[PDB]
Design an enzyme around this catalytic site. Structure first.
Site, PDB file in Angstrom:
ATOM      1  N   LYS A   1       0.833  -1.153   0.000  1.00  0.00           N
ATOM      2  CA  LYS A   1       0.000   0.000   0.000  1.00  0.00           C
ATOM      3  C   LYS A   1       0.870   1.203   0.000  1.00  0.00           C
ATOM      4  O   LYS A   1       0.917   1.938  -0.946  1.00  0.00           O
ATOM      5  CB  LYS A   1      -0.731  -0.005   1.322  1.00  0.00           C
ATOM      6  CG  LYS A   1      -1.702  -1.112   1.472  1.00  0.00           C
ATOM      7  CD  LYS A   1      -2.578  -0.745   2.616  1.00  0.00           C
ATOM      8  CE  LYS A   1      -1.920  -1.038   3.962  1.00  0.00           C
ATOM      9  NZ  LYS A   1      -2.026  -2.503   4.329  1.00  0.00           N
ATOM     10  N   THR A   2       1.584   1.388   1.095  1.00  0.00           N
ATOM     11  CA  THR A   2       2.385   2.580   1.252  1.00  0.00           C
ATOM     12  C   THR A   2       3.133   2.878  -0.032  1.00  0.00           C
ATOM     13  O   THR A   2       3.011   3.945  -0.636  1.00  0.00           O
ATOM     14  CB  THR A   2       3.340   2.372   2.340  1.00  0.00           C
ATOM     15  OG1 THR A   2       2.610   1.955   3.515  1.00  0.00           O
ATOM     16  CG2 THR A   2       3.992   3.725   2.639  1.00  0.00           C
TER      17      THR A   2
ATOM     18  N   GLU B   1      -4.310   5.865   0.657  1.00  0.00           N
ATOM     19  CA  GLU B   1      -3.964   4.572   1.078  1.00  0.00           C
ATOM     20  C   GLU B   1      -5.087   4.113   1.956  1.00  0.00           C
ATOM     21  O   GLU B   1      -5.499   4.820   2.870  1.00  0.00           O
ATOM     22  CB  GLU B   1      -2.683   4.703   1.862  1.00  0.00           C
ATOM     23  CG  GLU B   1      -2.160   3.407   2.452  1.00  0.00           C
ATOM     24  CD  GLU B   1      -0.772   3.501   3.131  1.00  0.00           C
ATOM     25  OE1 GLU B   1      -0.477   2.560   3.896  1.00  0.00           O
ATOM     26  OE2 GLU B   1       0.060   4.444   2.893  1.00  0.00           O
TER      27      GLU B   1
END
EC number: 6.3.2.8
Lengths: 428, 427
Positions: free
Chosen positions: B111-112, B138
């Site tokens: 994600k990040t 996110e």
């Protein structure tokens, strides 16, 4: 995405969304097993509709919308999954349609339909040309969690799971959204703190944001004042009976002002808001030799409706004598609900019974008008008169009339054809 | 028309505030502390009351609260007392996404980094997208989210969860997009229940956007990407690992599916600088016994540490891999103990820190003195347990060799340690 496919497009629930999408500009297609009013209509509007579900019917579509009326097994449903095509349900689609639109959602246990109408009647007069089920969308929210309205009414709640369901339902408002709730409902008021959106109340209640005072019901009309939140007064004339409608037109009024509509429109709409059918239709006041009488026409043919109408009338005046002319519709019904009929119809002051309107049915022993009459006579609250030759009605009537009698011509058969002929005579 | 934020200073709360403001609403908010933010905000036209007092609630319509506001708060009690709605943080955030073109990135790992990559892509395309009309964000397991596109990078430690992602996937409009990793079976197995177009990515034969000829040279990744028209794009990635390749691609697929130009994407990924604390290079330092490299990683689960490891190897030729590892949470250590032994045993030298409790009580057998032992018994590397943080620099200098790559690994205060260490070593 450009072509939308409805499986079973003629089911209610679908045509509607389909028509909306169609005017939006999408391409529409679907299928159904029967070609009738609905399909022909959509069809002439530009849809491509097949009859019979066929696997080739999906070609071109990007999404396929389906009902729970459609079954696990449908060739179109089945084929679509295989072909990747996103299959969504009527509900989700309806929600989508709301997302970029300004939708008002009428929810509650009682009053949803009338409120919804009352609001549409209003937006219409306001020249807002709303859409109902421009950019405005008025819709009836029946206990749903998908709807994404900008305004939501809850008229009343009359279990913890139900309670939770509504909370979930209001949560779907936008941060800047509005919930309009009935101040007179404790359940509701108990939920306010939990809502988390702006809240407008309406009611008779001490604390209503939109308060109703001095309401008085004259005949089948209602009279009252409402106090907006800034202490400005609006004198309402409501063309239907009971406090409960006052309550619903006040949800309406509430919803209306707060989006900025002229009191003129608001008031005009209501002034001219019928019950959507043949209820409390006043045909005229008439001076007969034995008195002046109001003659009113009402469609109620089931003990319940017949009940509401009498109570309405009672509250309507308060001393008037109610003389009702009833025509039972159908032998089946009178048989099934006989005892119930005896009760309700014994709630009037004078009663003339017409013969059953058969509607198709062959007579059933002991479920006819003599039968009702006798049963009614046995109760002893009212001594009925039976009139089988309607040609005689006006004369029997003129003999029992009393100044200031309200005469209800009640039923749904030819009863309204008869009462109108009675006005014609009297007119002459 | 007025939005009040309790504790507006928080990042996470400022973002939404700021966005809410350029939209044109009218913002006010409170914080115990003044600072960069608040002035920044105040300066755009935000009324920042330093300190909580029931009078700061003037002319508001709704109150946005973070997850750091508690029972005693003054603006909270009156708010509730004055019939003003109280909204939490995300819902308030989800609202914003609604009328916007949100691209939400979700999943177990990546994600990040994926959001980052995606932002730089659109940035480079001159789209000037907002990140945390476009909105790239996110999403950490998120059902309020109303996005037009949602990526799901992976899902690995359940049925209950699976069902959650599915529902998440649904919040998409009928005409929306789900970008999911094609090389992951669970994911590839939920596909049907999506009810929305799905594009997939990865190394696998069936990838909509497929990766081929991947080779990490230097700590940069080279590889070619097969777009849906069999059109070919060669990618230069400034970050290591196949894991990151995967991330970059899902980033490329979103861009591609939105019609962005290859030249802007390729430039974007070739120009990638790396997300903080993710194989983050803190630089080279000459110590008395070697010139070493120091790298800061987040990986706390064992698979993530693995890739991290394989990643470094793929770019450090013949040289050594040294790790300083800090288990995160006593509970996780116990759950995945053995696996931790396995993965930590794959490095040349190991320094172990004590567990970072994150709140938990110690569990017997699950701390670091226990890992060390197990690890030792395995016999691949002999770990050193360093309980007194102050001694780290010294113990490190004692075992270092010219050319080492040192991995400061973990989710806890390990990063803060490492940076201090670096700072110290710079001067």
């Amino acid at each position: 995405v450009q072509q939308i496919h409805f499986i079973g497009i003629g089911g209610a629930g679908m045509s509607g969304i389909a028509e909306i999408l169609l005017n939006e500009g999408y391409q529409i297609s679907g299928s159904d097993i029967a070609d009738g009013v609905v399909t022909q209509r959509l069809a002439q509007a530009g849809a491509k509709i097949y009859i019979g579900h066929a696997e080739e019917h999906i070609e071109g579509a990007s999404v396929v919308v389906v009902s729970s009326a459609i079954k696990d097994d449908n060739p179109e449903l089945v084929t679509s999954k295989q072909k990747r095509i996103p299959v969504i349900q009527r509900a989700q689609m309806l929600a989508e349609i709301m997302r970029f639109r300004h939708g008002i959602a009428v929810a509650g246990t009682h009053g949803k339909t009338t409120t919804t109408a009352m609001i549409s009647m209003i937006y219409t007069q306001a020249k807002l040309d709303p859409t109902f089920v421009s950019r405005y969308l008025i819709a009836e929210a029946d206990e749903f969690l998908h709807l994404q309205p900008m305004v939501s009414v809850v008229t009343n709640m009359e279990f913890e799971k139900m309670k939770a369901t509504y909370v979930k339902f209001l949560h779907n408002l936008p941060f800047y959204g509005l919930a309009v709730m009935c101040a007179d409902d404790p359940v509701l008021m108990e939920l306010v703190p939990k809502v988390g959106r702006q809240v407008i109340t309406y009611g008779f209640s001490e604390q209503a944001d939109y308060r109703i005072e001095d309401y008085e019901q004259t005949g089948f009309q209602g009279h009252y004042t409402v106090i907006c939140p800034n202490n400005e007064r609006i004198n309402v004339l409501l063309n239907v009976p009971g406090k409960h409608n006052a309550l619903n037109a006040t949800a309406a009024l509430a919803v209306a002002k707060e989006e900025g509509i002229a009191n003129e429109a608001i008031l005009e709409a209501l002034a001219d808001f019928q019950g959507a059918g043949r209820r409390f239709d006043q045909l005229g006041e008439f001076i007969r030799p034995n008195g002046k009488v109001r003659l009113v026409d009402d469609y109620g043919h089931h003990p319940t409706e017949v009940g509401v109408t009498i109570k309405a009338a009672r509250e309507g005046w308060g001393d008037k004598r109610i003389v009702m002319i009833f025509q039972p519709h159908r032998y089946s019904r009178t048989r099934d609900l006989f005892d119930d009929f005896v009760q309700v119809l014994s709630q009037v002051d004078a009663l003339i019974m017409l013969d059953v309107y058969a509607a198709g049915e062959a007579p059933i022993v002991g479920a006819d008008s003599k039968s009702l009459c006798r049963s009614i006579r046995n109760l002893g609250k009212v001594d009925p008169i039976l009139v089988s030759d309607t040609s005689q009605l006006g004369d029997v009537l003129d003999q029992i009339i009393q100044d200031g009698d309200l005469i209800l011509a009640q039923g749904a058969g030819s009863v309204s054809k008869i009462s109108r002929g009675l006005a014609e005579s009297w007119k002459n």
